[PDB]
Amino acid sequence: ISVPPGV
Amino acid sequence: ISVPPGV
Amino acid sequence: SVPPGVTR
Amino acid sequence: LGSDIKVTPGTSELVEQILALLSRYLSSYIHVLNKFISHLRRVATLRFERTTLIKFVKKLRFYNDSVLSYNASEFINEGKNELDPEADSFDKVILPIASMFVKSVETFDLLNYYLTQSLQKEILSKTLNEDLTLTAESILAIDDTYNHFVKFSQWMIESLRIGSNLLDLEVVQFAIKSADEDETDNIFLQEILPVNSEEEFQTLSAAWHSILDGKLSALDEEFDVVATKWHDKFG
Amino acid sequence: LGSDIKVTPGTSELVEQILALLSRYLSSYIHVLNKFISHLRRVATLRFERTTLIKFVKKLRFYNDSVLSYNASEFINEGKDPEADSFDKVILPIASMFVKSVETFDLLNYYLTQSLQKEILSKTLNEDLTLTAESILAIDDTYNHFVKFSQWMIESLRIGSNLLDLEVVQFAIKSADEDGTNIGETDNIFLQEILPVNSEEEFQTLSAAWHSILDGKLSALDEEFDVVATKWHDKFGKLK
Amino acid sequence: LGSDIKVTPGTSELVEQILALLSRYLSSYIHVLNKFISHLRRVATLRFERTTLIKFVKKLRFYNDSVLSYNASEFIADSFDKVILPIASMFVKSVETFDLLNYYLTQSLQKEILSKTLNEDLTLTAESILAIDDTYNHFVKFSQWMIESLRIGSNLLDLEVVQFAIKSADEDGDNIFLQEILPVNSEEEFQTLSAAWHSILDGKLSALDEEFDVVATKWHDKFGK
Amino acid sequence: LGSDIKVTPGTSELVEQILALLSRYLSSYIHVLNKFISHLRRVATLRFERTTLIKFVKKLRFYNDSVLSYNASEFINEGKNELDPEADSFDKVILPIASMFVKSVETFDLLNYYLTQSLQKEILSKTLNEDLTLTAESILAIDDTYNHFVKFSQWMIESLRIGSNLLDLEVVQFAIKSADEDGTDNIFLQEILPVNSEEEFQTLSAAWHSILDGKLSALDEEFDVVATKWHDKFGKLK
RNA sequence: GAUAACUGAAUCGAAAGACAUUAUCACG
RNA sequence: GAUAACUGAAUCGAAAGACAUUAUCACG
Ligand SMILES: [Mg+2]
Ligand SMILES: [Mg+2]
Ligand SMILES: [Mg+2]
Ligand SMILES: [Mg+2]
Ligand SMILES: [Mg+2]
Ligand SMILES: [Mg+2]
């Protein structure tokens, strides 16, 4: 899963 | 329908 | 399919 | 934007009562669908339709578990003697409940179509077997229950002026658009009066509660008649 | 439960950018489904299925019309305050719309990618009107990311509740808690922790990075939807 | 092998009477199957079964046309064996075809229908299945009698079901098909036994037609014109 | 009707050779069907179809047992001097053989329709894959073998003028009626020359034998390719 | 719970061997 | 004969244009 830098 | 006393 | 002397 | 209206000590209980209606609607379907899904195991040609119903029954059972485990008092800040820089507004509290009703109603709209129309036809085309279909009366009760929950949801929202595009129901908008290109007889088109206090909301909710309970019982009755029908024919 | 966090002048625009992602996901489905529904009009054995899809495409089209006509600035009171709306108050209806949409897509995705795919094959004995494997992957991948995005919007602001839970997220939590809970190494997408955000700036920034990711997925989805439309045309639609 | 027995002037007519029984058995099926095949059009799940029945009804119809257009006097001093042999052979071919169709129609298809639809309006009646089996058994035994009574039997004319009953008996120690057939000693004796057989088979064919009408009526009452 | 032609000492053997071709056709089917019927035991949705095939394979296995246990010399009276004019006529001897061929061929027609058309569609509809279907090449071989056995049977019968309504094959009559209502020519519609002696029949039989044997080998080869497919696509473990 | 039993000799297994004391199916 | 009708804007067609005055199916 492409999760933003720092969710 | 049935809409109660005052709707 | 069919050998000589069967058909014409 | 809404009401000036604050929560009272009786708000928590009002919310639980509203939620309980929705749990009862959901459960009523879940019970009749478990049964149908079980009779369909025996019919080789209806295998994929069976799975589609399973997928719907799961969504309902999830919505019902979520509603049953929601503790409404947890999300409500009443103040002390009506402390206002702590007391929740009534709108803040109803909004998530109304939103849940809307989501559930839209799900029922999709399931009702599948169950009462296209599947009924598919069943007759596949099997010619009318023992497998719903009764006419159960279909009437299905529609009648949906219409009243639509209207109840419209009332909760419009009466407090917390409506928005995001909370509109497809069927209500369809009736408004249809009317504007044809005062009026339609169930969903009738004006909703703003309520001016919680007392007035409480009272109207209770009257609504009576009506919907009522429709839910007629629905349960017709669901039992149909479960009995399948049982008499299939075992 | 939430944030202390107030709206700023840039909040309205942030909300429109989030809603636009949802409109684009909805529209993408609506466009492919109009096409599929058109081809199916010519297959006698798929008549009732065709109607079931019509019923879904209406629901999507309704949601998309609702989103497109929503004016977010109407529902936002910035101050100059403390009349100022809290950021939670503003995100909540947006999140709630996302949740409704996502659950709808879950039901449709199951119908469209599983049962209907099978029914089609069983009824017609070919693959002319099935989906491609790659479209199914793009479908699942896009849903997964919109699930996670919606989870992030809600959990990062602590506005979660039973009523906002998504079925698939709760499934993965309940499955983990009775399978292991390998909660560090954590391969599952939905099981990873969400950090609370501490300001609107931090939300804004993470929204934008999310926006870039979802836009990527939506373009891959559009790509695969064009490949499959082309397939239907080449395999079924066109004359011979 | 056989008799020594010669044809008489009444032989042609005897043969036409035997062939007419077979035409009547074939036609009876053809009529009920045309009906069924028509009702099945409406059931989407039964499409490939319907086409299998079509394939069968065509074979029956072909056998019936072939029998009806056969002029027995054209093919008739000939020995009585020479004349009965092609008739017996036609009976055997027909009987084996019926065995296959009967299995498909009364067993596997009946089960497939219930599995697909749960719809018992679409099935045969129990009584039609009994009349089906009873008619087959008698045509088997009649064919066995035509062949064995004249000693024109051979491996090529054996019927599956007769041989099954013999092999089954030989590995146990009375069965319809296992009973001895007396050699006939003249055409008069064959003529007479044929006529008694004709009476019995005509009785069975009427019971079959009756049950076929009961089922056709059933499908019509439930499924409509 | 027929020839005038008498049996010779070599007649018994000619008949055994003809019968053996039929046995080999029957056995070739029985072998592939036993295999298919075994794979199908493991597919719950194909249970009733499996029983229909079993019913067919039994009818084939019965015809093949009958043919294999038939002793042709038992049913042939040769006389002892080329004439002996109580010697069996060649027609009397071929007729039951031709009749057995006809019965078989008609059975194969029914089975071929079920096996290559309706069942193939039903399998796909029921299982959603091609793992247990036939190959296109096996279906071609099936049809090509049938067509040749039809024509061979037609040749046996017409060449001796022993034809009758009772010996007509459905497919030959279909081609004749179809032509007469339409009216690169159709294999079954071509004229068959009367034979004038047993020597001429013997030699044409042998040439036919060589052709049918070629077709039976092609059929066997495609039956092995398909058995291998079923093994690789369904049978074996994953 | 349900389903599956040729008048077979195939099928599965590298093998030993398995084949109703069996195999398969089933809403997280 | 039978089947098919979004609260659509697609679909088909190189275009013109077609779309129940239509399309498809069939032991017709
Ligand atoms: Mg349907
Ligand atoms: Mg389906
Ligand atoms: Mg069957
Ligand atoms: Mg079939
Ligand atoms: Mg319309
Ligand atoms: Mg619209």
XYZ file of C-alpha atoms and ligand atoms in Angstrom, chain D residues 49 114 118-119 122, chain E residues 48-49 52 111, ligand 1:
10
model
C -26.643 -15.502 -7.104
C -31.610 -7.227 -6.571
C -33.785 -8.975 -11.042
C -33.265 -12.063 -8.882
C -33.556 -14.671 -12.886
C -31.351 -9.270 -15.623
C -27.766 -8.802 -14.819
C -28.586 -4.980 -11.690
C -20.732 -8.373 -8.017
Mg -29.809 -11.495 -11.920
